[PDB]
């Protein structure tokens, strides 16, 4: 068959390229022929494209496990059967222990291997299903989208829609998270995202109305499904926006398929999707790990016998076709702090796209204005319109000021008759105004000919018209060069005629003394 894409809702199901996987609860997932997969799975994702051996280089590939008992030719043939039934088969890039660590430059070779693989096997597209380390390893965030653009474009040249999907774990979908670049770069290119709402344990979100809603809380599954989707489809509560027509809810097929996340009561899902529909935002489908688990056995060797597709197949397919959200996007906008009197350009770094990823940065308009000449806050609003929709985003610009700093104003002692220059070693500076040393004034003088304490106040005038000012003080002590009688010690013993300095005077002992303070022994005492 040829490139078969889906225009209506999807029920996506992953297909293990290996046999006898072990379940989180002791159960078993056999390998299955493609042709045995329930027709209601209209997207089947071959798992996984990966690096098989670093000795083959960095570009991941696909190699069928022969023990699934499908020849290469027969595998191609079962793909062809699915296609002739109108169903899609994707290659899923990633999975555990994928050893995908791409460098800048690798985008050309990756694209070529993707196309090679799609032409040989008859794949209809590619699901980005990166494991943790791989989301961010080396230049993956750049190489994988760059290559995927080239691939989407190759097949658009011949009139085909090569599909692009992604399976991020939901906690990665916050506005500034690790999946950002995949979602923004492939904006307009991707066909839908199927996040994994499972294996994240107590992770979840806070709904200012009703509290904390955890992905593993079975009492509040309906609220989990609804608020997490509502958040994604409106880009609220700190999630990157994924339009409802492009959102597929990923689940474990049963308790053996994932550690946490399985929906115990399907009603919770039916009701959550029904509420989303009621607000005019029906979702695009559901996804599951995996067809094998839906066909596996639990640990008492009892057969799961298709329970997942029994629960959700008819529910998802019996719905209207999706209605495209055509709102455009704004990128690069972040509240920003600017130094007083810097040049500020409101457009720099800001870009926009229409809903199919065309660049429409030129159409961006800005209201509000910044005065960098006055400290304070200024609100800008950016807006852009296209295909009869509009998006806006605010931006806070705060203008602020930094105080200059003095250096070299420390208290110092100088010897009588020295020369003292109040400015030697003294300067001032500011980060944008520079060397302000010439803007400093000195109040007070030092008389080096006269022992004593001289207090100097340094003033710095600065800013526009030198109308700002700071102040600091310094004490300069002019001390005597001349040697004197040693200071009296409370503990020392003194002899008649021994002399000491104490409290500014010189005193002579009239006899033997210990511990009597000169000045305290009255008119006729030991110290005169």
Q: What does R_g of the chain's alpha carbons equal in angstroms?
A: 39
Q: How far apart, in whole angstroms, are the C-alpha atoms of residue 349 and residue 517?
A: 77
Tokens 């979840």 -> residue: 204
Specify the pairing of strand 405-407 against strand 351-353: unpaired
Q: How far apart, in whole angstroms, are the C-alpha atoms of residue 243 and residue 341?
A: 41
**Do 81 and 33 contact (CB within 8 A), yes or no?**
no
- Binding to Na ion by residue 268, rule CB under 5 A? no
Minimum CB separation of residue 50 from Na ion in Å reads: 21
Nearer to its own copies, 206 or 511 (CB): 206
Minimum CB separation of residue 405 from its own copies in Å reads: 10
Is 289 assigned to a binding site? yes
- Binding to its own copies by residue 52, rule CB under 8 A? no
- Binding to its own copies by residue 334, rule CB under 8 A? yes
Q: How far apart, in whole angstroms, are the C-alpha atoms of residue 139 and residue 53?
A: 19
Pick the stretch among 177-185, 250-258, 300-308, 470-478 that binds its own copies (CB under 8 A): 177-185
Pick from 146, 189, 164: nearest CA to 353: 189
- Binding to Na ion by residue 83, rule CB under 5 A? yes
- Binding to its own copies by residue 278, rule CB under 8 A? yes
Q: How far apart, in whole angstroms, are the C-alpha atoms of residue 60 and residue 95?
A: 12
Q: Which of 74, 101, 113, 131 is catalytic?
A: 131
Which residues ranging from 2 to 31 are in contact with Na ion (CB under 5 A)?
Answer: 4
Q: How far apart, in whole angstroms, are the C-alpha atoms of residue 417 and residue 246?
A: 86
**Do 308 and 14 contact (CB within 8 A), yes or no?**
no
- Binding to Na ion by residue 122, rule CB under 5 A? yes
- Binding to its own copies by residue 492, rule CB under 8 A? no
* Alpha-carbon separation of residue 195 from 54, 198, 289, 495 (angstroms): 29, 9, 11, 96
One character per residue 362-381, x = contact with its own copies (rule: CB under 8 A): ---------------x-x-x
Which residues ranging from 180 to 209 are in contact with its own copies (CB under 8 A)?
Answer: 180-181, 202, 204-206, 208-209
Q: How far apart, in whole angstroms, are the C-alpha atoms of residue 189 and residue 187?
A: 5
Is 258 assigned to a binding site? no
- Binding to its own copies by residue 468, rule CB under 8 A? no
Q: Where are the beta strands (DSSP E) in 267-375?
A: 285-289, 329-331, 336-339, 351-353, 365-367
Choose which of 85, 132, 418, 441 interacts with its own copies (CB under 8 A): 132
- Binding to Na ion by residue 161, rule CB under 5 A? no
Choose among Na ion, its own copies, none what residue 392 binds, the Cβ cut-off being 5 to 8 Å by kind. its own copies
322 Cβ contact partners less than 8 Å away, ≥ 6 residues apart: 7, 8, 9, 244, 245, 246, 282, 284
Query: Is 101 one of the annotated active-site residues of the chain?
Result: no
- Binding to its own copies by residue 349, rule CB under 8 A? yes
**Do 488 and 495 contact (CB within 8 A), yes or no?**
no
Nearer to its own copies, 323 or 453 (CB): 323
Pick the stretch among 28-36, 275-283, 359-367, 437-445 that binds its own copies (CB under 8 A): 275-283
Q: Give the binding site for Na ion (CB under 5 A).
A: 1, 4, 83, 122, 124
Chain residues binding its own copies by CB under 8 A are 132-133, 136, 141, 174-178, 180-181, 202, 204-206, 208-209, 211-212, 214, 234, 236-238, 278-281, 331-332, 334-335, 337, 349, 377, 379, 381, 390, 392, 394, 396, 400-402, 431
- Residue positions annotated with a catalytic role: 131
């Amino acid at each position: 068959g040829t490139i078969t894409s889906q225009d209506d809702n999807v029920v996506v199901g992953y297909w293990h390229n290996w046999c006898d996987g072990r379940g989180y609860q002791g159960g078993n997932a056999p390998c299955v022929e493609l042709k045995t997969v329930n027709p209601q799975y209209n997207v089947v994702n071959i798992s996984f494209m990966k690096v098989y051996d670093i000795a083959e280089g960095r570009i991941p590939t696909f190699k069928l496990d022969p023990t699934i008992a499908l020849s290469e030719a027969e595998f191609i043939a079962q793909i062809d059967t699915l296609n002739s039934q109108g169903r899609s088969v994707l290659i899923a890039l990633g999975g555990a222990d994928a050893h995908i660590e791409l460098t800048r430059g690798d985008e050309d070779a990756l694209a070529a291997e993707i196309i090679r693989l799609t032409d040989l096997y008859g794949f209809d597209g590619l699901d980005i299903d990166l494991e943790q380390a791989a989301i961010t390893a080396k230049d993956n965030q750049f190489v994988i989208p760059a290559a995927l653009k080239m691939v989407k474009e190759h097949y658009r040249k011949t009139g085909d829609n090569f599909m692009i999907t992604m399976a991020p774990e939901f906690p990665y979908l916050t506005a500034n998270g690790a999946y950002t670049p995949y979602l923004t770069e492939l904006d307009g290119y991707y066909d839908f995202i199927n996040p994994q709402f499972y294996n994240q344990g107590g992770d979840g979100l806070w709904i200012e109305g009703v509290g904390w809603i955890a992905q593993n809380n079975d009492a509040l599954k309906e609220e989990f499904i609804y608020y997490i989707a509502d958040s994604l489809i409106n880009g609220t509560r700190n999630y990157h926006k994924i339009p409802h027509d492009k959102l597929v809810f990923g689940l474990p097929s049963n308790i053996d398929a994932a550690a946490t996340g399985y929906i115990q009561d399907p009603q919770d899902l039916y009701k959550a999707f029904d509420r989303l529909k009621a607000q005019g935002q029906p979702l695009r489908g559901v996804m599951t790990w995996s067809v094998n688990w839906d066909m596996g056995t639990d640990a008492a060797n009892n057969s799961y016998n298709q329970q997942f597709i029994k629960d959700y197949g008819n529910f998802i397919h019996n719905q209207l076709p999706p209605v495209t959200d055509m709102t455009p996007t704004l990128s690069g906008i972040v509240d920003t702090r600017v130094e007083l009197d810097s040049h500020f350009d409101p457009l720099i770094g800001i870009t926009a796209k229409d809903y199919q990823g065309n660049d429409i940065t030129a159409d961006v308009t800005v209201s509000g204005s910044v005065n960098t000449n006055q400290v304070g806050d200024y609100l800008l609003t950016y807006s852009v319109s296209s295909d009869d929709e509009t998006t806006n985003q605010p931006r806070k610009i705060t203008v602020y000021e930094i105080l200059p700093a003095f250096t070299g104003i420390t208290d110092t002692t100088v010897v009588i008759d020295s020369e003292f220059d109040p400015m030697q070693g003294v300067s001032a500076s500011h980060p944008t105004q520079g060397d302000l040393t010439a803007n400093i004034t000195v109040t007070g003088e030092v008389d080096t000919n006269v022992v004593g304490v001289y207090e100097l106040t340094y003033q710095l005038f600065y800013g526009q018209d030198n109308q700002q000012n700071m102040t600091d003080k310094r004490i300069v002590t002019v001390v005597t060069d001349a040697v004197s009688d040693d200071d009296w010690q409370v503990g020392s013993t003194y002899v008649k005629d021994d002399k000491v300095t104490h409290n500014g005077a010189t005193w002579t002992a009239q006899w033997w003394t210990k511990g009597e303070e000169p000045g305290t022994t009255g008119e006729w005492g030991v110290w005169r």
